[PDB]
Amino acid sequence: TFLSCSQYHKMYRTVKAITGRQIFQPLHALRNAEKVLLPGYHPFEWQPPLKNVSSRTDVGIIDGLSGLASSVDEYPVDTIAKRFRYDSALVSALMDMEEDILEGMRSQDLDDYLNGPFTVVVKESCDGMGDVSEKHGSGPAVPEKAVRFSFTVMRITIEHGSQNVKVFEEPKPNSELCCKPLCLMLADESDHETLTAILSPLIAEREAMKSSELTLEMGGIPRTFKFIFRGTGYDEKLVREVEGLEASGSVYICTLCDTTRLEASQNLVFHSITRSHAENLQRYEVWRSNPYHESVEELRDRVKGVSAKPFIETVPSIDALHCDIGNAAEFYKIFQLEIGEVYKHPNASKEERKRWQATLDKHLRKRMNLKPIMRMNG
């Protein structure tokens, strides 16, 4: 309900005085349950030592700078960043979903004294926020932009005997209610230096725990967990920026295949997914070393677009609204072309196409009774 503490205490004491008995609970037990539910409360362990990661398990929010010296004689930086510990937030999410996964296991013809190794599919995502500053002193002061890095659990499975059984499947993972956040930064999305400096420890811990075994207590029985991470909650801009590709410019535009715009326009269905992460690393190494001594454009075409060093392995995907609007735009364009009898006209003028679009919009507003607009949407 987005309630503060003073007014909550006021309502609490008012209800306690009116009803006589105590029905609500004061801020003491509330904060107690809060700090109990927050990450970094219950113990856990890992069979591998988890190198480069401490073994302390009673810490929560920490500075996102990761001990970055920001004194006068260093690189200027003032973006305040806060973060959780990846393992801590992960075990906290697992603990708060323990009840749901136990209910699912009981429903799926399974007992309670079961051991792992459970398999948890965890997806990661991060995106900016835009203006988050309500400046009212003198008006628009600064376009302060923020960013959040988060994760989400959407699949929990267990393999017993021969086959497996999905004891937990998220009903709607594309929602704003199961987006467990890791870190928050007051940095621009275009600021590559600060973003990389803040996201490097998270990626380090991720790569460290990618091949580990979690051991946790749920109901008095030790349970073993393994995790499979998937980067698929990034838009095409962030994928193209992080994976070392160029901007939205030159002919190299596909993120799943190494084709070009001209090759795609010539051969439409003649491509398959080939852009991996190790391939991009090798292409960047070739770009940096240039073991053939070729011209700029020669090696640029040889590396096929990539010109920067990627640092986050991602699994690209595609959105439904985008794949629908990309086809609707071409349908609208081919309709505009076909309502002008262009197969007979050798040339095409701007006034001709303008009048054709005007006639099309007029007929549409007359028949279907809608409002045409050049701003294409979904």
Partner: protein
């Protein structure tokens, strides 16, 4: 499709309006504890336990 089996329908203001609400309603000054508080509240808001206790009116 063969890799995942679901193209999905993920899409906005849900990341900015909620953040500004948490920052304006319950947060501190000095830009030091403000982020800690908003992160704690955002973590508490997406808890399956709290949501399960909330939506219990359907059954």
């Amino acid at each position: 499709i063969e890799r995942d089996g679901s193209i999905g329908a993920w899409a906005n203001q849900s990341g900015n309006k909620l953040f500004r609400r948490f920052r304006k309603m319950n947060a501190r000054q000095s830009k030091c504890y403000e982020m800690e508080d908003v992160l704690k509240h955002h973590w508490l808001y997406t808890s399956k336990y709290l949501q399960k206790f909330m939506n219990a009116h359907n059954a």
